[PDB]
Amino acid sequence: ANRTLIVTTILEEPYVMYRKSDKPLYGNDRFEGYCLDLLKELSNILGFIYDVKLVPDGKYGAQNDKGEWNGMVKELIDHRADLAVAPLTITYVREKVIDFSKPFMTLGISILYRKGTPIDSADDLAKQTKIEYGAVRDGSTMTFFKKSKISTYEKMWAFMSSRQQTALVRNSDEGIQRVLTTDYALLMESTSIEYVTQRNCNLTQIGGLIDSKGYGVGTPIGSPYRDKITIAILQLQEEGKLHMMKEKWWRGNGCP
Ligand SMILES: N[C@@H](C[C@]1(C(=O)O)C[C@H]2OC[C@@H](O)[C@H](O)[C@H]2O1)C(=O)O
């Protein structure tokens, strides 16, 4: 039989979540969400079974000064996993070191905050000095700011970096808790802002999208699966299945 593929992933609602049960769950059955449905579809098309493993360091992946990667990106570079199936952003820096599939979803960075402020854009956010802001540590949003040559975003990076110990949060849940309980705005991908703001009516998006990009399945460079995964994603795209999956996991609208 075909070797069981190792899938690296990360907990992120509604992509990958713990299933709630009153009885024991083991292996892949512990997880549910958009990315688990995606895996069920992809595996049917490609002819494999798989083993879902949460990334040990709990990170998406960024490179340090020495050029060393961490998170799911490192798992792929080091051939610890066959595929990364997660809300994993397709970026220039990552594409040089792993092989991404074509995108299964598009999104852009925007701002998550509470309601009631006059802040209406990243320019407003960077200029004012009343509320702090940051991003999840070692993801693509952090890297977007780290790499930017746009003045507003360079300032925002300098600010985030100066207060990194505090401004850069471990995960999105810590980020949202910080937004809810302190004067802190979270830089977050728009599809995640969409999800949270239809559930917690105290939260809102600030401004529009500051970029545009996609999520893709990651594989190690040279992977014999990437092209087959791309073909399968295009099939799911054209058949309307990706759209159906988004509707299933984001349903519905709960806030004014
Ligand atoms: N997709 C990113 C990870 C992350 C981000 O950096 O925004 C981290 C986490 O942040 C919240 C929201 O943007 C989304 O659920 C997640 O995106 C990546 O591939 O590095």
CATH number at residue 240: 3.40.190.10
Nearest-CA residue for ligand 1 atom 20 is 139
Q: E-strand spans in the chain?
A: 5-9, 17-18, 31-32, 50-54, 83-84, 98-100, 105-107, 109-114, 132-134, 184-189, 203-206, 213-215, 218-220
50 in the same domain as 18: yes
Structural domains of the chain, count: 2
224 in the same domain as 197: no
Answer whether 134 contacts ligand 1 (Cβ < 6 A): no
Burial (CB count within 10 angstroms: exposed 0-12, middle 13-18, buried 19+), residue 252: exposed
> 85-101: b or e for each residue (b if 16 or more CB lie within 10 Å)?
bbbbbbbeebeebbbbb
Answer whether 12 contacts ligand 1 (Cβ < 6 A): yes
Q: Which atom of ligand 1 is nearest to the CA of 88?
A: 19
3-class secondary structure, 239: coil
Q: How many CB atoms lie within 10 A of CB 212?
A: 10
> In the 8-state DSSP scheme, what is residue 105?
E
> In the 8-state DSSP scheme, what is residue 89?
B
Distance of CA 7 to the CA centre of its chain: 16
Q: E-strand spans in 50-174?
A: 50-54, 83-84, 98-100, 105-107, 109-114, 132-134
Answer whether 82 contacts ligand 1 (Cβ < 6 A): no
19 in the same domain as 115: no
Answer whether 141 contacts ligand 1 (Cβ < 6 A): yes
192 in the same domain as 131: yes
- Record the resolution, in angstroms: 1.5
221 in the same domain as 201: no
Contact 54, 35 (CB under 8 A): no
Q: Which atom of ligand 1 is nearest to the CA of 87?
A: 1
Contact 119, 206 (CB under 8 A): yes
52 in the same domain as 3: yes
> 63-76: b or e for each residue (b if 16 or more CB lie within 10 Å)?
beeeeebbbbbbbb
Q: How far is the CA of 125 from the centre of ligand 1 (A)?
A: 20
Q: How far is the CA of 189 from the centre of ligand 1 (A)?
A: 6
Contact 16, 33 (CB under 8 A): yes
138 in the same domain as 198: yes
Q: How far is the CA of 111 from the centre of ligand 1 (A)?
A: 12
Residues with Cβ within 8 Å of 141's Cβ and at least 6 positions away in sequence, in order, are: 109, 135, 187, 188, 189
Last residue of a domain, one of 212, 227, 248: 212
Answer whether 172 contacts ligand 1 (Cβ < 6 A): yes
70 in the same domain as 127: no
Residues with Cβ within 8 Å of 175's Cβ and at least 6 positions away in sequence, in order, are: 112, 134, 135, 136, 169, 186, 188
CA distances from 159 to 40, 120, 181, 208, 230 (A): 42, 19, 20, 21, 38
HSE, side-chain direction, 13 A CA sphere, residue 95: 12
Answer whether 139 contacts ligand 1 (Cβ < 6 A): yes
Contact 156, 164 (CB under 8 A): no
Our mutation pick for probing the ligand 1 site, out of 34, 69, 140, 212, counting the most ligand atoms within 8 A of Cβ, is 140
What pairs with residue 252 in β-bridges? Answer: none
244 in the same domain as 158: no
208 in the same domain as 227: no
Residues with Cβ within 8 Å of 233's Cβ and at least 6 positions away in sequence, in order, are: 42, 101, 102, 103, 104, 216, 217, 242
95 in the same domain as 12: yes
Distance of CA 23 to the CA centre of its chain: 30
3-class secondary structure, 20: coil
Answer whether 192 contacts ligand 1 (Cβ < 6 A): yes
- Rounded Cα distance between 96 and 224, Å, is 17
153 in the same domain as 53: no
Q: How far is the CA of 220 from the centre of ligand 1 (A)?
A: 20
Domain holding 189, by residue range, is 108-212
